[PDB]
Design a protein around this ligand. Sequence first.
Ligand SMILES: NC(=O)C1=CN([C@@H]2O[C@H](COP(=O)(O)OP(=O)(O)OC[C@H]3O[C@@H](n4cnc5c(N)ncnc54)[C@H](O)[C@@H]3O)[C@@H](O)[C@H]2O)C=CC1
Ligand SMILES: NC(=O)C1=CN([C@@H]2O[C@H](COP(=O)(O)OP(=O)(O)OC[C@H]3O[C@@H](n4cnc5c(N)ncnc54)[C@H](O)[C@@H]3O)[C@@H](O)[C@H]2O)C=CC1
Ligand SMILES: O=C(O)[C@H]1O[C@@H](O)[C@H](O)[C@@H](O)[C@@H]1O
Ligand SMILES: O=C(O)[C@H]1O[C@@H](O)[C@H](O)[C@@H](O)[C@@H]1O
Lengths: 469, 469
Amino acid sequence: HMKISIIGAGSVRFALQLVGDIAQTEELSREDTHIYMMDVHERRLNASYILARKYVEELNSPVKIVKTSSLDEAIDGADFIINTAYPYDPRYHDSGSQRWDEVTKVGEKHGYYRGIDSQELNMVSTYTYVLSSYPDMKLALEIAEKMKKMAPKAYLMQTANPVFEITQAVRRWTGANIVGFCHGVAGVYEVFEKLDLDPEEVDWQVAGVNHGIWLNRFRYRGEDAYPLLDEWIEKKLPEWEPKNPWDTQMSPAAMDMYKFYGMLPIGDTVRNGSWKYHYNLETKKKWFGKFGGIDNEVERPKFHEQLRRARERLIKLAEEVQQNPGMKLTEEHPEIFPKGKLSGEQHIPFINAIANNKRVRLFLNVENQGTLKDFPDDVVMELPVWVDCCGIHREKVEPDLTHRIKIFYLWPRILRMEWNLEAYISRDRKVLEEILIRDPRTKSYEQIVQVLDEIFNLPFNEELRRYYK
Amino acid sequence: HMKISIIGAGSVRFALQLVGDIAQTEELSREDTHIYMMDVHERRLNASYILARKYVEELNSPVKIVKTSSLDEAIDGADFIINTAYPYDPRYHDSGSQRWDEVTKVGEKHGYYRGIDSQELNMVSTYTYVLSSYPDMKLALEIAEKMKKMAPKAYLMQTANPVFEITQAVRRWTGANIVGFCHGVAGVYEVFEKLDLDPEEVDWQVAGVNHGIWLNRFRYRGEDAYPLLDEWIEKKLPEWEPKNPWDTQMSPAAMDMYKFYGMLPIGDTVRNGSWKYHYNLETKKKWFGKFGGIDNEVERPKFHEQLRRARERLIKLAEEVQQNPGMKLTEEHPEIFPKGKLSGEQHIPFINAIANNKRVRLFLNVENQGTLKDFPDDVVMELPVWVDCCGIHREKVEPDLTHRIKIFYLWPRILRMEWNLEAYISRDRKVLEEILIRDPRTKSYEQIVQVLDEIFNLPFNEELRRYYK
Ligand SMILES: NC(=O)C1=CN([C@@H]2O[C@H](COP(=O)(O)OP(=O)(O)OC[C@H]3O[C@@H](n4cnc5c(N)ncnc54)[C@H](O)[C@@H]3O)[C@@H](O)[C@H]2O)C=CC1
Ligand SMILES: NC(=O)C1=CN([C@@H]2O[C@H](COP(=O)(O)OP(=O)(O)OC[C@H]3O[C@@H](n4cnc5c(N)ncnc54)[C@H](O)[C@@H]3O)[C@@H](O)[C@H]2O)C=CC1
Ligand SMILES: O=C(O)[C@H]1O[C@@H](O)[C@H](O)[C@@H](O)[C@@H]1O
Ligand SMILES: O=C(O)[C@H]1O[C@@H](O)[C@H](O)[C@@H](O)[C@@H]1O
């Protein structure tokens, strides 16, 4: 009996991907595999459940799917708990992106471009919420404590943001068996494609923290391959153009960071630069090309609207499935319901490694434990690991990250994580103030007080306001 | 034979203090004690030598005093080398304070209040020079390398700023026997005086980095004494007034920092707060009282002019001594030439501990070596140590510094030291730029380039400009 529970199974960016992967993984697509779909949004949960059931049928998979509005029921005796939830106050909002949107506009009103949650080395939209990410950390810690009673052997597979802060806090404060998941390492394959390198011929490694990872080893035919990137920078960077707002891996910003740090930032790390690349939209367009990346006042609202429409369309699609049970989702919407191909995400490979000993190399957020020797043992890093039946085994990171990455990038970002955790556990508004006192956009202490006041006074922040009272 | 060499013996703030202390220390005031006074400024050196000789005579001390314009001669076979030098370009300036003054005004011209060298947790005027402190680190490293050849057993007693950065760099890059010296810990005695506590009855300890030290233990009659500070804050802080621009130990800023960190910052640490206390002069006056402290555009030029006049007066006084050899310096200028009382500084007690086994507790800048276990072994900290014939022995720091001091204060300041060292050893202007990219006062990258350009183009920065070319 194998219980895989998806907390936040109304999630538009994970739910069906996870079900499809499980149903197309030979060792997991069994009658003994029970997928629990749990969510607080009844319409989204019902929709996700209908689609998941129909989808699994078309894939001819025998997995059992259960829906529940009870967190306890989903956790009870689970083998794996995947946290993709994004809390929201249902009195005012329909999804969690709305609270970040609105607090961001309040931040900008008081002179914080892209909101107070956007900070140096932490520009990724929605990553933190009012610095300490109260609703998101609260939920993860609640899951962790229920787990230690009701599912001791379970892995908590943390996907909801902030992955770094939350994974650290749950590990440190509860010792629950939490592992943070993010696939930003996939950006390396674009580097290899742009440099005309067969990926199977590249000897590569990446290491760092979540959204702060670096191509520390990049070798080809028994030589350092970074000279090939130097040649690309000289000859092809002038003609580089982003295909869409998300396309930044080979951007001027990424290469400027590589020149300074000595290793290429990978994936969302490229979004998480210094303020040099982010002062305003015109600056973002210089360094990321025509869209200004995704983390700006034009493209991010556009993307969040796209997600809102997608949720709504999936609810209508589920109703169409109930009205037309003969329709084939895999035929009429192959983009949403792929068949044959796996998604490439790391969650189900991890489960199959633990449960079925299908050993695999993954990039996961786990305690350092000496892998990067200049950093504390207990600090959660995003590291190359091999996973199998019987443990998570860290690769030796070689070559080591450069001196400049350590002192100018990793340590400041790790300190920010500690600031954010202290802001949460202390319940002390003065810690939030201190974080903003280190913010380049702050002009005065009075400004800090006023922006936090207005954020805290938003109706949907009642619980947050009382937490810090 | 005991050779004590003062490098920068024209120093207005140390030279005569050191000579008077040596001449009034029984075990050192001997014919076998040779004090070498070395300086590049001929008139100041000649003046300091005349006054030192006359002074020692009036103290009836048999120490021999030698003057030399040769650094090599001063280092050769020295037992102790005290570095109080403050480099300057003699084509344009007469002393080292002038280059900092002028670069500060350039910084302010480009929108950096109190200059680019003033940073969060690093407001102390003149501490660094263009971030990496090129002339000051260059001299210290030169002394260190000459030492390892010409005076292997010597201690390099580093007093010139930046003490933290320089002591770290010399230790790490040369392994010379350097110890950093600063007496900011003396602020604790004001705390005890304001709280009506006999200092001999107080069980206290301080620890941190240079100008970043904290009253980690403060106990009285077998209880924590910090409640007595809480009572003073409630009852007497409203009436507190600074006696002069330097008086900050019991200021609103110091108490605001104590409330946040849980321990009282000591001495110049109180100057080295966040930008909360330093946005502008009006802000400084709110938090430090009527003068706005010493690190502002009114009081610092006043103080540097006072030092310039003092140097000039000592040169004239030496000429008066040559014209009137019967005058008694100890009678007509007891403030400059004290008799009987020692100065209370740590330099000569240290020498007497090493050379004569007069064991003493001092607060010195030495490698951490596990004393503060959450920090690297090799990072130079300002620590309570016992010094004797045969070593420097670190006290156990108990209680440990608070979590907030570690993550919000010590680690950021330690990272800044690493940034500044990297800026020096790399010879890479991009590192200086990155430091300013983390500066809250930066509005744009172009501003950074322009302010460094104008600083580098100052005539007296020719050597610095070529170093970074
Ligand atoms: N680690 C990674 O690779 C990535 C992280 N994320 C993050 O994953 C999370 C979800 O992202 P989206 O799919 O866009 O959000 P979503 O709003 O589409 O889905 C979140 C689901 O969680 C539900 N939910 C809210 N509170 C809940 C609670 N207490 N218990 C159970 N369910 C609850 C919501 O009703 C909703 O259905 C966010 O934190 C997002 O920032 C998003 C993309 C990739
Ligand atoms: N660690 C501590 O307790 C304190 C640190 N300081 C620092 O000590 C240093 C001196 O301070 P002041 O007495 O006010 O300066 P000062 O200008 O009065 O004396 C510096 C002396 O060093 C000489 N000098 C310059 N380059 C030299 C070189 N290559 N070799 C030999 N001598 C050289 C100068 O001619 C001058 O006579 C500064 O760095 C200052 O910031 C000042 C007060 C306390
Ligand atoms: O921008 C986004 O919404 C997402 O982008 C992905 O790349 C990040 O891994 C994830 O943390 C973000 O939530
Ligand atoms: O302000 C100053 O000039 C001096 O003040 C002292 O307290 C500091 O110890 C020293 O580093 C400074 O050089």
